[PDB]
Amino acid sequence: SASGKWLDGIRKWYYNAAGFNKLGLLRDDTMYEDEDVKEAIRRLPDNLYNDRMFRIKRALDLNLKHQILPKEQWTKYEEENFYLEPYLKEVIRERKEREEWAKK
Amino acid sequence: TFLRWASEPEHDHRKRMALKMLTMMALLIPLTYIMKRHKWSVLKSRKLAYRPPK
Amino acid sequence: SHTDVKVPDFYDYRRLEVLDSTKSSRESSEAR
Amino acid sequence: GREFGNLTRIRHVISYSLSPLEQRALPHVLSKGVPNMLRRVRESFFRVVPQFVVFYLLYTWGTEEFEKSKRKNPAAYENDK
Amino acid sequence: AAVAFTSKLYSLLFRRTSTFALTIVVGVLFFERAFDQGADAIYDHINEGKLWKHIK
Amino acid sequence: TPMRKSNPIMKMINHSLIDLPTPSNISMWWNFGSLLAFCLILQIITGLFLAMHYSPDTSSAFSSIAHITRDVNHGWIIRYLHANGASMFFICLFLHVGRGLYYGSFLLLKTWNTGIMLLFLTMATAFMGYVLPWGQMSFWGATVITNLLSAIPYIGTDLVQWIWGGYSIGNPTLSRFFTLHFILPFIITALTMVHLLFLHETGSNNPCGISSDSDKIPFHPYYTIKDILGLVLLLFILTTLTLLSPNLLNDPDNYIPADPLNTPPHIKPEWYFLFAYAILRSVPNKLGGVLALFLSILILSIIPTLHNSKQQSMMFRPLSQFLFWFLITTLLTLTWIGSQPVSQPFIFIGQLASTMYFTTVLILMPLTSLIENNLLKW
Amino acid sequence: IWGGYSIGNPTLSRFFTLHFILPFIITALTMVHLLFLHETGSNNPCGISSDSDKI
Amino acid sequence: MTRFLGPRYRQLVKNWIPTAYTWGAVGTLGLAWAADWRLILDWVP
Ligand SMILES: CCCCCCCCCCCCCCCCCC(=O)OC[C@H](COP(=O)([O-])OCC(O)COP(=O)([O-])OC[C@@H](COC(=O)CCCCCCCCCCCCCCCCC)OC(=O)CCCCCCCCCCCCCCCCC)OC(=O)CCCCCCCCCCCCCCCCC
Ligand SMILES: CCCCCCCCCCCCCCCCCC(=O)OC[C@H](COP(=O)([O-])OCC[N+](C)(C)C)OC(=O)CCCCCCCCCCCCCCCCC
Ligand SMILES: CCCCCCCC/C=C/CCCCCCCC(=O)OC[C@H](COP(=O)(O)OCCN)OC(=O)CCCCCCC/C=C/CCCCCCCC
Ligand SMILES: CCCCCCCC/C=C/CCCCCCCC(=O)OC[C@H](COP(=O)(O)OCCN)OC(=O)CCCCCCC/C=C/CCCCCCCC
Ligand code: HEM
Ligand code: HEM
Ligand SMILES: O=C1C(=C2CCC(c3ccc(Cl)cc3)CC2)C(O)=C(O)c2ccccc21
Ligand SMILES: O=C1C(O)=C([C@H]2CC[C@H](c3ccc(Cl)cc3)CC2)C(=O)c2ccccc21
Ligand SMILES: [Zn+2]
Numbered sequence: 122s123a124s125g126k127w128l129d130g131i132r133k134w135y136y137n138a139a140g141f142n143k144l145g146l147l148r149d150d151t152m153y154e155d156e157d158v159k160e161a162i163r164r165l166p167d168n169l170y171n172d173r174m175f176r177i178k179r180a181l182d183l184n185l186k187h188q189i190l191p192k193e194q195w196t197k198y199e200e201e202n203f204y205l206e207p208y209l210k211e212v213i214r215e216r217k218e219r220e221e222w223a224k225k
Numbered sequence: 226t227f228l229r230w231a232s233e234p235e236h237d238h239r240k241r242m243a244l245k246m247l248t249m250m251a252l253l254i255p256l257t258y259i260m261k262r263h264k265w266s267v268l269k270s271r272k273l274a275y276r277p278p279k
Numbered sequence: 280s281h282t283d284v285k286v287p288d289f290y291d292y293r294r295l296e297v298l299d300s301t302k303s304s305r306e307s308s309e310a311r
Numbered sequence: 312g313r314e315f316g317n318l319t320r321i322r323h324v325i326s327y328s329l330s331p332l333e334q335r336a337l338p339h340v341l342s343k344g345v346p347n348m349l350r351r352v353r354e355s356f357f358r359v360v361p362q363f364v365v366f367y368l369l370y371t372w373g374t375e376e377f378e379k380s381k382r383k384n385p386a387a388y389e390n391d392k
Numbered sequence: 393a394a395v396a397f398t399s400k401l402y403s404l405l406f407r408r409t410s411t412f413a414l415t416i417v418v419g420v421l422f423f424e425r426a427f428d429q430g431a432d433a434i435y436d437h438i439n440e441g442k443l444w445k446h447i448k
Numbered sequence: 449t450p451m452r453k454s455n456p457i458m459k460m461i462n463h464s465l466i467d468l469p470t471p472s473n474i475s476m477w478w479n480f481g482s483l484l485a486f487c488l489i490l491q492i493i494t495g496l497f498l499a500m501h502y503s504p505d506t507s508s509a510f511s512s513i514a515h516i517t518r519d520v521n522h523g524w525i526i527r528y529l530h531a532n533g534a535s536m537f538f539i540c541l542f543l544h545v546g547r548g549l550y551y552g553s554f555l556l557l558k559t560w561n562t563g564i565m566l567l568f569l570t571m572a573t574a575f576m577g578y579v580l581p582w583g584q585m586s587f588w589g590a591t592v593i594t595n596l597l598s599a600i601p602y603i604g605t606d607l608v609q610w611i612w613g614g615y616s617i618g619n620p621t622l623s624r625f626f627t628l629h630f631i632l633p634f635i636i637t638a639l640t641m642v643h644l645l646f647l648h649e650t651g652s653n654n655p656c657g658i659s660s661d662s663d664k665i666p667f668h669p670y671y672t673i674k675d676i677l678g679l680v681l682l683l684f685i686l687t688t689l690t691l692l693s694p695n696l697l698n699d700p701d702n703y704i705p706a707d708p709l710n711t712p713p714h715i716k717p718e719w720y721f722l723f724a725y726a727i728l729r730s731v732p733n734k735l736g737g738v739l740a741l742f743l744s745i746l747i748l749s750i751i752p753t754l755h756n757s758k759q760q761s762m763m764f765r766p767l768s769q770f771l772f773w774f775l776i777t778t779l780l781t782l783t784w785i786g787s788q789p790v791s792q793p794f795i796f797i798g799q800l801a802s803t804m805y806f807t808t809v810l811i812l813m814p815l816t817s818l819i820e821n822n823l824l825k826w
Numbered sequence: 827i828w829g830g831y832s833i834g835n836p837t838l839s840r841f842f843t844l845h846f847i848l849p850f851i852i853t854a855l856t857m858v859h860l861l862f863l864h865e866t867g868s869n870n871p872c873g874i875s876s877d878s879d880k881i
Numbered sequence: 882m883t884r885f886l887g888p889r890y891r892q893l894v895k896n897w898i899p900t901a902y903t904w905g906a907v908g909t910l911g912l913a914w915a916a917d918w919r920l921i922l923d924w925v926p
Contacts, residue, residue, distance in 0.1 A: 263331050
């Protein structure tokens with residue numbers, strides 16, 4: 122039903138309003154590094170880790186220079202990669218399992 | 226006028242003194258701003274690159 | 280390997296005091 | 312503890328810099344800085360300003376109302392005698 | 393080649409830290425007096441006729 | 449090794465403000481802590497001088513200040529500087545708090561809690577200085593603030609009489625105000641050192657809310673000159689306030705000495721307090737009013753607990769930003785209401801502003817954070 | 827230091843302000859004193875090194 | 882929290898109840914003795 126197109130519309134609006142794409146950043150780059158997120162980052166393979174580090178340094182440099190990327194290079198909503206989500210879900214499952222053991 | 230003077234004797238000398246030290250504090254702003262800009266130009270023009278073996 | 284190295288150009292930022300080149304290098308340094 | 316020898320692990324990033332005495336301190340103001348400030352104002356205008364406009368309307372209304380309340384009502388003397 | 397003003401200024405005065413410091417004390421001695429005199433002149437001039445120094 | 453690193457005192461200085469790793473990208477909002485410290489130092493110096501001419505006795509306090517401002521050489525400007533420095537101190541304090549609310553730096557729990565302690569201490573200090581001139585406003589301010597403990601149900605009245613040292617406000621209370629006002633600033637100093645000790649174990653947050661360990665620069669020379677620039681600006685403003693327009697923030701009713709038999713028709717505290725006053729005015733019940741008064745500040749301690757967002761900073765969170773600025777306008781509204789008589793329009797407006805303040809902190813922000821999370825699909 | 831031609835009222839308030847503030851400077855310097863001490867540890871009556879019998 | 886609902890936590894709380902009310906007795910009697918609180922001390926023979 123149409124409701125899918127409608128919700129995706131508002132979601133795209135919110136994404137462009139947030140503006141981390143103007144700095145060349147992915148969504149999974151912008152998470153705060155709590156305990157689980159750090160453990161998920163530990164699990165990444167080397168290529169993803171290095172790409173993430175450079176992207177973040179580049180955003181920091183731009184922010185230092187009160188500037189943004191050219192529009193041609195902004196991250197687009199329809200071709201983004203949630204590279205960290207899978208690892209995070211596993212980390213959280215493991216912690217939940219341990220908790221559940223601890224109450225018996 | 227006399228009650229004005231009775232309430233605030235430091236009036237004239239205060240304005241006298243304002244001219245001086247305000248001129249000075251106004252002068253010191255652009256100078257220190259220049260010094261800041263000088264020290265920060267190193268970072269403001271920095272260029273990065275990423276070169277993985279791929 | 281490395282041999283492909285080249286610093287990108289900084290023309291926009293450099294001082295005119297060295298672009299107006301009619302004076303030995305070290306004397307310029309002194310003026311700046 | 313935290314010290315410039317072992318903060319994080321990075322690979323394959325190259326940097327380039329000039330010395331301060333080689334370059335200008337205020338290189339391009341009116342050709343680059345001014346438009347940048349303009350867009351920087353544009354990107355935040357509607358997230359900050361309307362709330363303050365509403366505050367201004369509320370303030371003026373409340374002042375006017377309080378000042379009306381202090382004026383004598385003719386019906387308080389004209390109505391019955 | 394071009395003996396220019398700021399280069400002479402660097403080489404004679406600013407190259408050595410002690411002499412830089414000496415230059416600074418010498419400059420402040422004279423700046424203080426010149427600056428005071430100018431300010432007092434302006435002030436006196438803004439409100440002639442109203443100060444008791446002259447009414448005396 | 450260099451001497452910079454040869455010795456514990458020197459090495460602590462070095463880890464504090466020479467080789468400390470700072471974020472490259474922090475903005476002007478991070479200058480206000482150093483300005484706070486500067487203000488504390490200014491206040492202590494000007495206070496130690498004033499102290500040597502003031503009289504903590506109800507039969508000469510007023511006249512001792514007259515003596516200071518008329519006969520002591522340049523005593524008037526020392527007075528002016530003290531009074532205006534307090535105002536600057538609170539301006540910086542408010543801006544300093546607001547930064548941390550916006551950029552999510554409350555997740556540094558120890559620093560945040562020590563900050564709340566410092567806020568409380570500074571307010572106490574400022575108020576106990578405000579009553580020393582023994583003018584007409586000072587007296588009734590004292591009276592109200594010391595009657596506040598009567599609201600404690602079982603032991604309150606006795607606490608009031610034990611703080612007064614008698615049946616009423618009087619000479620024995622003024623010396624207590626003066627001893628406490630003398631000692632508190634130094635406790636503030638010590639706790640500031642603890643505050644920074646806690647900070648330097650983690651380092652500074654930044655505007656983007658992401659980890660900056662890939663782009664740290666040293667504190668010296670960059671932030672040394674930056675903070676010096678900030679200080680120059682603060683001094684320009686302070687001088688213009690002291691010499692060009694000294695009466696801007698001044699109150700005439702405190703140039704009338706104290707009269708225990710008459711409260712003036714129009715009552716108004718110092719500006720940095722108005723908002724609390726408004727809150728206190730808004731509850732038709734004594735105990736409830738005092739409780740609200742104290743909760744208005746104590747509520748900061750549970751902001752870390754109500755945090756739902758995946759991201760730390762509001763830089764990338766627009767709905768959040770909208771609410772933030774609405775909260776700031778509520779506080780402006782309380783400040784404006786505090787200035788007005790206790791009459792009906794302002795009564796009603798103040799009650800709405802108070803309910804919206806607590807509402808916003810406790811309910812609206814958490815829920816908007818959840819909506820935001822759902823819009824980004826996590 | 828007198829604040830006048832002789833000992834008088836202006837001097838007593840100076841005595842009192844200074845007597846109020848000094849003890850706290852003493853406190854801070856005491857902390858520095860002990861900081862310095864704990865880098866080496868206590869000497870003892872015999873004047874020989876006690877690192878074989880520390881408690 | 883929601884984590885601390887379960888059997889072990891119930892058992893663990895039961896283990897410490899007595900010590901808890903004993904420390905409560907200590908604090909109450911001490912407060913009363915320290916503030917010469919007549920409301921409690923008038924009942925001590
Ligand atoms: C008789 C008394 C005389 C007194 C004389 C006083 C003279 C004072 C001189 C001061 C000079 C300062 C120079 C500082 C240089 C520092 C350089 C630097 O690095 O700066 C970085 C710093 C910014 O830092 P940053 O790293 O970018 O980080 C900040 C943000 O994070 C960045 O985030 P962002 O990028 O998202 O933000 C973008 C945008 C965000 O934009 C927005 O949010 C939107 C704004 C829209 C505004 C639209 C217009 C207004 C609203 C209208 C709306 C419609 C109404 C409709 C009504 C309808 C009703 C029906 O913000 C800006 O760009 C702000 C720039 C302007 C800053 C202005 C600062 C004002 C200071 C005032 C001081 C007052 C006290 C003086 C002493 C008084 C003593 C009595 O500032 C600048 O870059 C600007 C520098 C230039 C500032 C000049 C200020 C001059 C003020 C003169 C005041 C004179 C009048 C006084 C009156 C007193 C009354 C009592
Ligand atoms: C806010 C004001 C009012 C406060 C009132 C306070 C009420 C509570 C008072 C309790 C006093 C007794 C507590 C004993 C706790 C012993 C714990 C312990 O480790 O003991 C074993 C330890 C070590 O013993 P040990 O090592 O030999 O062996 C212990 C081993 N077990 C337990 C197995 C036997 O003993 C001590 O060294 C304890 C010294 C305690 C000193 C307390 C001094 C009195 C201070 C409080 C009274 C004064 C209040 C003044 C109020 C004035 C108001 C106006
Ligand atoms: C009589 C009128 C007044 C006269 C005043 C004269 C003095 C004027 C001001 C002079 C300021 C000092 C300038 C010279 C400082 C030299 C410091 C020095 O040599 O020490 C550097 C070296 C640096 O350490 P490292 O990093 O380990 O070095 C390794 C290098 N690879 O040593 C140090 O650590 C610093 C030591 C500092 C010593 C400072 C001595 C100051 C003496 C001041 C005397 C003032 C007398 C005033 C008299 C007044 C009338 C009674
Ligand atoms: C003598 C009388 C004094 C009266 C009281 C004075 C203090 C109160 C002053 C209130 C007005 C303050 C206005 C400050 C300028 C606002 C400029 C603005 O809107 O800019 C938005 C711009 C947007 O930037 P970013 O989101 O980071 O992204 C840009 C990078 N791409 O900057 C910000 O949003 C930064 C906001 C930082 C916090 C500002 C806080 C201001 C108010 C603080 C004090 C309020 C009272 C106390 C609040 C806390 C109470 C518990
Ligand atoms: C006398 C009062 C205070 C002094 C002297 C003081 C001093 C400082 C200084 C110098 C810094 C260094 C970083 C900066 O300037 O931003 C700082 C950081 C900080 N202050 Fe305080 N502060 C005071 C009160 C407060 C209050 C009232 C709060 C909160 C309610 C607070 C919370 C913080 C936090 C969270 C940081 C670190 C945040 C970050 O780095 O992102 N402080 N403070
Ligand atoms: C955070 C630090 C301080 C703050 C916020 C503060 C604040 C104030 C304020 C608001 C006043 C009243 C101003 C007026 O009536 O015009 C005052 C007065 C006074 N303060 Fe301070 N003060 C501080 C530190 C000190 C210290 C350390 C001393 C040490 C003796 C001191 C001594 C005095 C004296 C003697 C007065 C009365 C003189 C007068 O009213 O002009 N103050 N203080
Ligand atoms: O200004 C400081 C700062 C400090 C600098 C020195 C100041 C200071 C104040 C008074 C004296 Cl007598 C000496 C130094 C205190 C604040 C400090 O510790 C930080 O960690 C920090 C981080 C980011 C941006 C600014 C700062
Ligand atoms: O009626 C009041 C009044 O209510 C307060 C109040 C303002 C808020 C103060 C306050 C107390 C605690 C905190 Cl955390 C903050 C502010 C307490 C005194 C005054 O300051 C005052 C001054 C002069 C005359 C009358 C009055
Ligand atoms: Zn003067």
